[PDB]
Amino acid sequence: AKVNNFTLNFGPQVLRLVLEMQGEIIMRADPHIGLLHRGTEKLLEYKTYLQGLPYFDRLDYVSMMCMEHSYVLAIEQLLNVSVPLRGQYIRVLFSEITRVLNHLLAITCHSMDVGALTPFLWAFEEREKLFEFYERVSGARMHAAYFRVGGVSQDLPIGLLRDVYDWARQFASRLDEMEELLTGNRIWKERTVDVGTITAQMAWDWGCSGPILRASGIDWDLRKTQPYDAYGKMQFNVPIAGHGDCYDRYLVRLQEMRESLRIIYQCLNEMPDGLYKSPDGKVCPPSRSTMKQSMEALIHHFKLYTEGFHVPAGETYRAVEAPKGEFGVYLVSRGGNRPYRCKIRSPGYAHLQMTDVISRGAMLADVVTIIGTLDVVFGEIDR
């Protein structure tokens, strides 16, 4: 008959959803966002380039250093700054540690939303180990502010690689005992198989990236097609599935954790000795002993910590294979010590736009599975 749609309000308690149903089947989904919009793009125009760096830790706060990476690379390209070899290796190693942290949280929060509670509690102790790795090099468990223009902020303390190797020696066993509860379980399969299917044409038309794109049969990894730092030296595989399923994305994310472990092991054995910061003193601040003994270093310390370096006029867009997809910064420079315009491109913003076409024909108990498999964090969505 002339059946009107029944509508539903889904949660003030920070995603708001307005669904329409024709019974038990959804016909429309409209996300209402902006409950975490804090105006960080306006606030970055009132900061110097070093001042605005800790804003990026608070965009995807599950994956911090990867958010820092693209802003730093965008500044370095316009400045024409080269990063030394050891700093590039450190950046790759901590980017892969960051990806492991993000994928642990994403898979276990998804499986908790579905109903399995134990894998969350099993994976968060490994997350605690990697937080200790963040804290030992930056003094902060989450918002490290570690990656800087021209390199990293401090050197690795003596004894870090020993412990990273000791964690990586048992992480595969942890991922194995994680999959015994979920991979060959019929309830998890019946919740995840053929739910929210994405084909390749829809993936490129809807601006998808990351593990969504690899589960639809597309071989596209930015660490292999447009490499940055020492990612071209790294030997690893791109996992590929072909259904576009929630189940296939779960399998791709687990394999990406395995490949991140492989890159971590390679970085632990090829870590070179040398400088970790670029030797251009007009961009990178001097060491604290040098500042207390030479006049030029003290002048450069004074000026770099007040006015900051001046970026030459121009523009660039630089992107990083963040663990949720492509994270990019569009930096517009007029020539000052402050960004003229800093647009932030987030993958979860594009992934959440698809919920109207992905939830069609699904039921109410599959909305939370779709939201969980898109891997969304509203700090980067709502800038």
């Binding site: 030394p84 020696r169 048992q170 194995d176 490499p227």
Partner: protein, 90 residues
């Protein structure tokens, strides 16, 4: 099967404030300790933008563009992936 939770002294045997060997961190290159001149390495201020002559009556030959392309599986040449970004020796 590797066990989670290692026992005593098998993980983080020394605290980071009691490092058993003193650390000597390089903060400058040996090439720049006594050779300090800057204008030979001022990459920031030496880039240029040049206005091209007005792209109107140029000759785009498509024959040359498609004459350098292969037609057989062998004789296909691929650009290798760059191993590292430029470090300029440091």
């Amino acid at each position: 099967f590797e066990h989670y939770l290692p026992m005593g002294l098998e993980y983080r045997k020394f605290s980071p404030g009691t490092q058993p060997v003193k650390a000597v961190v390089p903060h400058d290159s040996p090439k720049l300790v006594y050779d300090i001149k800057y204008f030979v390495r001022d990459y920031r201020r030496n880039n240029k933008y040049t206005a091209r002559t007005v792209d109107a009556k140029t000759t785009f030959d498509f024959d040359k563009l498609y004459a350098g392309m292969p037609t057989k599986p062998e004789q296909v040449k691929n650009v290798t992936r760059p191993l590292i970004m430029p470090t300029r020796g440091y």
